[PDB]
Amino acid sequence: MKFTVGNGQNQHKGVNDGFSYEIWLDNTGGNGSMTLGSGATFKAEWNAAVNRGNFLARRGLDFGSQKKATDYDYIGLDYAATYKQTASASGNSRLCVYGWFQNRGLNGVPLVEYYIIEDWVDWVPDAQGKMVTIDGAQYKIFQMDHTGPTINGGSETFKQYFSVRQQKRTSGHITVSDHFKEWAKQGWGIGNLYEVALNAEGWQSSGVADVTLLDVYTT
C-alpha cells in the first residue's frame, strides 16, 4: 500500500480493487510516494523542486481501447481531495482527469492525451480556445500538438485535448462524457477510450494530493 520513487526505483504501476495506479519520477532528481487507499483512493506526495524535476501519480479505470470515447452514454467521476503545492522552483502542478484516446486501427483519427484540469498552481497549459459550460461551470477548451513519448512508444507527434476549469476546486462531480462531447463538437477526432484517471502532476515543484474520495463509472 505505499510505493516510493527517487531512491532506487522511479516508477511503479499496477492495479488494486479494480483501479489502476501509477507513480513516476524522471531521472532528473527528487523523490515521491503514493499510498493506496480502498477503491481508487490514494495519497501522493512529491519533492521535485529541482531543475527539470518531473513527477506524476494517478489512479483510474481502464476501458481497454474498445470503442470510441463518445459511444459511452455516460461517464462520471466523483472526487474529493486535499491538494497543496509547498515548493516551486519556477514550477507548477495540476490536479486533473486524465487519459488517452487510442487511434490504433483508426484511419483519420489522431492519438490523443486528454486533460480535464480542475485545479493548478503557478502555471497551466493554455491556448486560443472556447469557453463552454459543463456541470454548471465554465471550462476553457482547446487542443494543441505535442511531441513526446506515448502509450504506444517513444517520441511521436500527437494531440492533446484540454478542458481547464475557470473556478479551481478540489472536489466534486465531473461528467467526463460531456467534456468528450464538447471536444467532438469542435470537429476534433475521437479515438477509442484507453482510460479515465485522476492525475496529480508536478514540474519543478513539491506538494501533496490526498485523494480521499474517487469514483469512476459508466452508465
DSSP string for residues in 122-167 = S-----S-EEEEETTEEEEEEEEEEEEEETTEEEEEEEEEEEEESS
156 catalytic? Reply is no
Q: Is 201 one of the catalytic residues? A: yes
Catalytic residue among 118, 182, 195, 201: 201
Angle (nearest 5°) at CA 170 between 57 and 51:
45
Residue 57 neighbours by CB under 8 Å, 6+ apart: 21, 22, 23, 24, 32, 34, 42, 44, 46, 199, 200, 209
Domains of the chain: 1-219 (2.60.120.180)
Let me know: does 60 contact 195? Beta carbons within 8 Å. yes
Experimental method: X-ray
Give the side-chain half-sphere CA count within 13 A for 130. 11
Resolution stated for this PDB structure, in Å: 2.1
| The one catalytic residue among 22, 45, 113, 182 | 113
DSSP helix/strand/coil, 177: helix
Residue 146 near residue 156, CB atoms below 8 Å: no
Contacts of 145 (CB under 8 A, 6+ apart): 157, 158, 159, 160
CA distance 212 to 171: 10
Q: Do residues 186 and 31 touch, judged by C-beta distance below 8 A?
A: no
